[PDB]
Design an enzyme around this catalytic site. Structure first.
Site, short mmCIF file in Angstrom:
data_model
loop_
_atom_site.label_atom_id
_atom_site.label_comp_id
_atom_site.label_asym_id
_atom_site.label_seq_id
_atom_site.Cartn_x
_atom_site.Cartn_y
_atom_site.Cartn_z
N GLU H 16 80.10 14.58 31.08
CA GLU H 16 81.38 15.18 29.60
C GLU H 16 82.02 14.32 29.65
O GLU H 16 82.64 13.93 28.94
CB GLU H 16 81.85 16.34 29.51
CG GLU H 16 81.14 17.58 29.56
CD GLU H 16 80.36 17.63 28.00
OE1 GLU H 16 78.99 18.18 27.80
OE2 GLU H 16 81.04 17.24 27.08
N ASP H 96 72.30 14.48 22.76
CA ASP H 96 72.15 13.79 21.93
C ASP H 96 70.98 12.39 22.36
O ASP H 96 71.20 11.45 21.32
CB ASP H 96 73.05 12.80 23.38
CG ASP H 96 74.43 14.03 22.75
OD1 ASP H 96 75.51 13.95 22.25
OD2 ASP H 96 74.37 14.64 24.24
#
Lengths: 52, 61, 109, 33, 101, 89, 48, 247, 180, 196, 84, 77
Positions: H16, H96
């Site tokens: 993250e 992603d």
């Protein structure tokens, strides 16, 4: 003699084994396992043909 | 229509029986090597193409 | 059809109606009943069993029973219950080749 | 003569008479309508 | 819908569609843009382009030294690479003109 | 329900039929390129006209990209200007 | 010609249909129909 | 105590942090709203972005914007690979990867930005009659067309991966600060992301379409357009059957 | 020993599994003359284990993943040794990931402390971060092959891995080096 | 900052429509060399059919020129930013430090602001060309042989009809498990998930 | 349209018809498909002629494409379609 | 094609072409007038109302031969 036909029968005689008279078959499909076993046993049998 | 057809070379059957890389055209980018663009008879590029254009051209080999 | 062709000396669409019928029977010869020599004996890895007519959205006629085509369907025993139906895996287009070649051998003979 | 004897399917099909290349053109607009 | 005065317009166009831009110095770029914008904004009721059979048909609107006979149709500035030192054609010179009446 | 029409995986990947895609794709590609190139070659010789008409159109008015929340044809002043611009340049 | 598609009529004036059907497109139709009728004539026991 | 083991916390924090750092230093990108790692001891993680209505979807996307999004999507997986080693990568960064691949296939097959395919349209997004909101209309391609498109997609993707790796490597100190803040707090806001990143010397990406580059008095080898070719080997029976139908 | 092991399965059960990676890795490191293995470079089991666990993963699944995969990973672990700039980075990554008493608060950076400033705004190479993705690409091929194995794999990888394809023999014999 | 970005945007937008109307006017009013006319540039389906079936190759090339005038106009008028970015500053092409500022500029694509075509024009162009190819058998007429004939590729061999036609429920019962397999193994519930 | 089928003698085996009437239907069907193309009042808005359907799909529909070179799909890039 | 040159041809005759093809199909796959294919029925009418009219489940190597025979009929015509 004109009472015959020209109908083609594909798997006839020498065409009773793996390629089955199809020419493009070994460029489309990997040779199966049982086909390989058939070829192996026939090779060794016919190599025993002269020695028998 | 039996007896008609075409022969394997293209003939009808009735029933019974290098570019010139001379002037400025030889000074272009690669101009002779295998990395050159396809050319016409007189030495111009294939479709009217120039290295300016925003799309490449497919070499035959 | 073969009689019309041997009288006229030229093909017709009469054959078109013959072979259709024959082809059905020939397949039923090779696959379902097991009469051929497809495999060494005539036992084949796939067959197509009939369903009962009770499944079709059906009608009723005042006709007589057909001579051959509907009196030979007295020997079939279709399938009537849906959760006991057997369809083997379909063949592999290298096995289908050989099976339909047996159908062809029957028809040509 | 027998021009139909020399008809070739590979090299191109053409009749005897020389290429009736008559054509004229307006713009795309006056052609569409 | 929005508009802009002609000075702002000739500053967005810049050295607009000259073919030899991207190799021109920024000072020369500034000067050419300003001069031609002045011509376009002040004389915009009579500014013709000079008769084309005098300069633009002979091909004098874009001149290259590696292709004086114009066999590359006027794309020589793109099709031909720069000659190296000591090679035939060094040093290469190219010109671009514009003429108005 | 498998696919049964394998035909070639030795120098390409082919299935039964599809004996017409290479030809059709070559045609499409070459035609689009030739059209683009002819457009480029025409506009390459009319650059001053492009500059002049762009100047005029900017000072007349246009719809900004961000100001459009909700160009198929030309108004009338713009047509006078484009006709005269073809006559001059 | 149905809901849209079309492209076969030739006298409507719309963007689809040109008004006088240009002459090079009439020579072709005549050549087509002439060849078809000529072959249907010289064929033994065709329709009339 | 903590229900979560160390190395899992470390992996999700590094992921993250990488994604948020690269979404921060990329021009024209959206605003970070929340970055959280295993909130409420639920095994998960996300970087949330501020949804704006000032966006008008009818606006078109330039090439640089799409490439920036691709790089942002690869950022977190590259952060993992660079901090913990290839052998410790999980499959956590799969959506992603899916979105980066969607972007790279639509630039080449929907917008004609490949120099070797050209202006040909082979994909079409379409909205469902309203699960996902959308799907695609495709076109059956030959093997040559498809291999030429694949070469381009692979080029785009590996270039984007290299740019993400450099963008993370020249910000190692801010990456370290951000992952440590996440290890210690487990949920930070966009305001604090900005603060932690600025107090550590974050280095933004340049934007080439905002500078002047002009001048005012007040202060051989490769070529990008080389011709290509595809190599194939057809047999002889195959050439025969193609001439039969080429007439 | 086959007291009740049927004989058929009593032979396949003495397979000598070949479960682990270090015995395979040393058979590869034995080909480089510089290294000597302990219990010119001197390496022990802890260093090899840590480097491999960083670069490859878990170290006792060599049978689940194959032997070509292990041989490729061994080539990569061999090239990841033989120069210390990466060796020390890999060891420090391992140590931060484990997280004992000596975790060094982060691994080292991959970029020299010089190139970080060579690309800072006050540097020669800053503007390079603004070009297209067409300036960042690490591969260029003018001849595109008919196989995707040859597009997204390297040459060594292709040679090691092509025996697992689902193609005929004449097809597989057309990939990799033409030495055939 | 925003000033330069809007300068780029507006320059692109204006050059697009200028080049488009210039090619329009030229082809309609000067290739033919009574009254000056301006076309309306829209291609229906009936028009695509007419052009595909009855027109030569040059008519098609003219329609395509009309479609791509605006993109070519933008192309002729853009500033390649590579020179400006690597002059104001100074494996991969950005690794070369040798060469010459002039030939160090061809190593990769120019940095044009507005690159990539617009999807509507691509749809129009390919629709027109595909109609032409597939509804007009020039040079290859033996390719009508497989038309309206399906060769039964991926499916079960002999399958009987279904409730709309035959009141039998076995094929649908097997289709349901096929869909289960698709969701569990191949696709998942949404785009992006590894599995369910 | 107020609403022939061969799917009944293939899978359910009804065959409630004399062979002669079926043979006559086959004869007339072949002759009608082949020789009633573009004949006034004998050959019209008739779905029994395939060339009428060819013309319909040629002018109305857009160019149909060939099969794909993919796997796990039917022939085109699609899945098996719903049975009901 | 003989008069207007092979380049300036129109799609005007694409329906009649498809009619002729259709004849060659029935003669080979429905009336058994083929020489290597003989008297066997191969085609099925697709019960529907992409668009298909005929379906066939014959093997691929038999499809090769049947289509080659259709093609040589059309060449002779």
């Amino acid at each position: 003699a004109a009472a015959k036909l020209d109908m083609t029968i594909f798997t006839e005689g020498a065409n009773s084994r793996w390629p089955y008279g199809i020419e493009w078959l070994d460029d489309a499909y990997p040779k199966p396992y049982w086909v390989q076993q058939q070829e192996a046993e026939a090779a060794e049998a016919q190599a025993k043909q002269p020695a028998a | 229509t039996t007896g008609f057809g075409w022969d394997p070379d293209g003939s009808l059957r009735y029933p019974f029986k290098t570019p010139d890389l001379s002037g400025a055209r030889g000074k272009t980018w690669f101009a002779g090597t295998a990395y050159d663009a396809p050319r016409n008879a007189d030495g111009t590029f294939k479709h009217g193409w120039h290295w300016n254009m925003p799309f490449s051209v497919k070499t035959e080999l | 059809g073969f009689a019309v062709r041997t009288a006229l000396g030229e093909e017709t669409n009469f054959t078109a109606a013959d072979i259709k019928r024959a082809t059905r029977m020939a397949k039923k010869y090779v696959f379902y009943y097991g009469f051929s020599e497809a495999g060494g004996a005539g036992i084949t890895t796939w067959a197509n069993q009939p369903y009962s007519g009770d499944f079709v959205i059906g009608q009723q006629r005042a006709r007589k029973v057909v001579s051959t085509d509907a009196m030979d369907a007295f020997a079939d025993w279709p399938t009537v219950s849906e959760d006991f139906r057997f369809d083997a895996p379909s063949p592999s287009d290298v096995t289908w080749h050989r099976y339909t070649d047996e159908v062809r051998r029957v028809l040509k003979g | 003569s027998n021009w139909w004897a020399s008809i070739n399917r590979k090299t191109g099909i053409r009749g005897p008479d020389p290429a009736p290349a008559e054509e004229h053109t307006n713009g795309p607009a006056r052609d569409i309508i | 819908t929005e508009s802009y005065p002609a000075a702002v317009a000739n500053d967005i166009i810049g050295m607009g569609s000259w073919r030899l831009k991207d190799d021109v110095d920024p000072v020369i770029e500034f000067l050419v843009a300003r001069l031609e914008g002045c011509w376009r904004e002040i004389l915009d009721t009579d500014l013709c382009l000079y008769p084309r059979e005098k300069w633009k048909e002979q091909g004098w609107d874009l001149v290259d030294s590696m292709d004086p006979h114009q066999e590359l149709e006027g794309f020589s500035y793109a099709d031909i690479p720069d000659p190296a030192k000591g090679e035939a054609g060094y040093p290469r010179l190219q010109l671009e003109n514009r003429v108005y009446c | 329900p498998k696919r049964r029409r394998w035909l070639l995986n030795n120098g390409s990947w082919n299935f039964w039929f599809n004996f017409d895609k290479l030809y059709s794709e070559e045609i499409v590609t070459t035609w689009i390129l030739e059209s683009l190139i002819q457009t480029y070659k025409y506009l390459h010789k009319n650059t001053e006209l492009l500059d002049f008409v762009t100047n005029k159109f900017i000072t007349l008015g246009y719809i900004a990209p961000e100001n459009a929340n909700l160009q198929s044809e030309l108004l009338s002043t713009k047509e006078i200007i484009l006709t005269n611009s073809f006559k001059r340049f | 010609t149905a809901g849209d598609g079309g492209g076969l009529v030739g006298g409507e004036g719309v963007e689809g249909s040109p008004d006088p059907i240009p002459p090079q497109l009439r020579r072709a139709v005549s050549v087509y129909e002439a060849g078809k009728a000529l072959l249907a004539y010289i064929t033994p026991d065709y329709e009339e | 105590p903590d229900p979560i083991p160390p190395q899992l916390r470390r992996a999700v924090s590094v992921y993250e942090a990488g994604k948020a750092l690269l979404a921060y230093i990329t021009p024209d990108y959206e605003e970070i709203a929340r970055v959280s790692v295993c909130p409420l001891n639920v095994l998960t993680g996300f970087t949330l972005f501020v949804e704006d209505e000032d966006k008008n979807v009818n606006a078109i996307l330039t090439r640089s914007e799409l490439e920036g999004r691709m790089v942002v999507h690869l950022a977190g997986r590259c952060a993992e690979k660079l901090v913990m080693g290839e052998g410790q990568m999980t499959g956590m960064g799969s959506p992603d990867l899916f979105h980066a691949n969607l972007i790279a296939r639509e630039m080449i097959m929907s917008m004609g930005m490949g120099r070797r395919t050209g202006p040909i349209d082979l994909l079409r997004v379409a909205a469902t009659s309203e699960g996902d909101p959308f799907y695609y209309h495709t076109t059956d391609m030959s093997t040559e067309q498809a291999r030429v498109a694949l070469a381009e997609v692979v080029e785009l993707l590996d270039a984007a991966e290299a740019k993400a790796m450099y963008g993370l490597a020249i910000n190692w100190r801010a990456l370290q600060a951000l992952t440590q803040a996440l290890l210690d707090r487990g949920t930070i806001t966009g305001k604090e992301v900005a603060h932690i990143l600025e107090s550590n010397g974050v280095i933004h990406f340049p934007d080439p379409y905002t500078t002047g580059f002009g001048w005012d008095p007040d202060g051989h080898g490769w070529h990008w357009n080389m011709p290509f070719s595809v190599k194939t080997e057809l047999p002889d029976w195959y050439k025969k059957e193609v001439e039969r139908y080429s007439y | 020993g086959g007291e009740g092991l049927d004989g058929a399965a009593a032979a396949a059960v003495v397979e000598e599994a070949g479960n682990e990676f270090l015995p395979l890795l040393k058979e590869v490191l034995g080909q480089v003359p510089g290294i000597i293995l302990t219990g010119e470079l001197r390496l022990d089991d802890a260093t090899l284990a840590a480097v491999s666990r960083t670069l490859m993963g878990r170290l006792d699944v060599v049978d689940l993943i194959g032997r070509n995969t292990a041989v490729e990973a061994a080539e990569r672990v061999r090239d990841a040794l033989l120069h210390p700039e990466t060796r020390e980075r890999l060891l420090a990554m391992r140590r931060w990931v484990e997280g004992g008493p000596g975790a060094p608060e982060f691994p080292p950076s991959p970029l020299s402390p010089e190139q970080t400033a060579a690309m800072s705004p006050s540097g020669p190479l800053y503007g390079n971060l603004a070009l297209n993705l067409d300036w960042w690409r690490r591969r260029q091929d003018n001849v595109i092959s008919w196989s995707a194995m040859e597009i997204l794999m390297s040459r060594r990888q292709v040679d090691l891995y092509k025996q697992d394809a689902d193609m005929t023999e004449g097809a597989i014999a057309k990939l990799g080096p033409p030495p055939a | 900052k925003k000033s330069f970005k809007k300068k780029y945007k507006d320059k692109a937008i204006i050059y697009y429509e200028v080049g488009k109307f210039v090619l329009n006017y030229f082809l309609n009013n000067q290739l033919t060399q009574d009254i000056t006319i301006f076309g309306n540039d829209f291609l229906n389906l009936k028009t695509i059919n007419y052009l595909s079936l009855y027109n030569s190759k040059n008519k098609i090339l003219l329609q395509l020129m009309l479609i791509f005038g605006g993109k070519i106009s933008q192309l002729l008028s853009s500033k390649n930013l590579v020179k400006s970015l690597k002059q104001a500053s100074i494996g991969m092409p950005l690794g070369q430090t040798h060469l010459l500022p002039k030939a160090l500029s061809v190593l990769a694509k120019p940095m044009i602001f507005s690159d990539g075509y617009n999807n509507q024009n691509l749809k129009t162009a390919t629709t027109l060309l595909l109609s032409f190819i597939h509804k007009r058998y020039l040079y290859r007429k033996n390719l009508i042989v497989p038309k309206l004939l399906s060769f039964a590729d991926g499916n079960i061999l002999d399958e009987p009809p279904s409730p709309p036609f035959s009141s039998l429920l076995i094929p649908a019962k097997r289709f349901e498990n096929y869909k289960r397999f698709f969701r569990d193994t191949l696709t998942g519930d949404k785009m992006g998930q590894r599995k369910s | 349209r107020r609403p022939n089928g061969s799917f009944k003698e293939d899978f359910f085996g009804s065959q409630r018809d004399e062979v002669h009437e079926k043979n006559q239907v086959v004869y007339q069907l072949t002759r009608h498909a082949i020789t009633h193309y573009k004949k006034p009042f004998k050959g019209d808005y008739s779905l029994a002629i395939p060339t009428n359907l060819y013309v319909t799909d040629l002018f109305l529909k857009l160019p149909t494409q060939s099969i794909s070179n993919l796997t796990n799909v039917e022939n085109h890039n699609l899945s098996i379609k719903n049975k009901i």
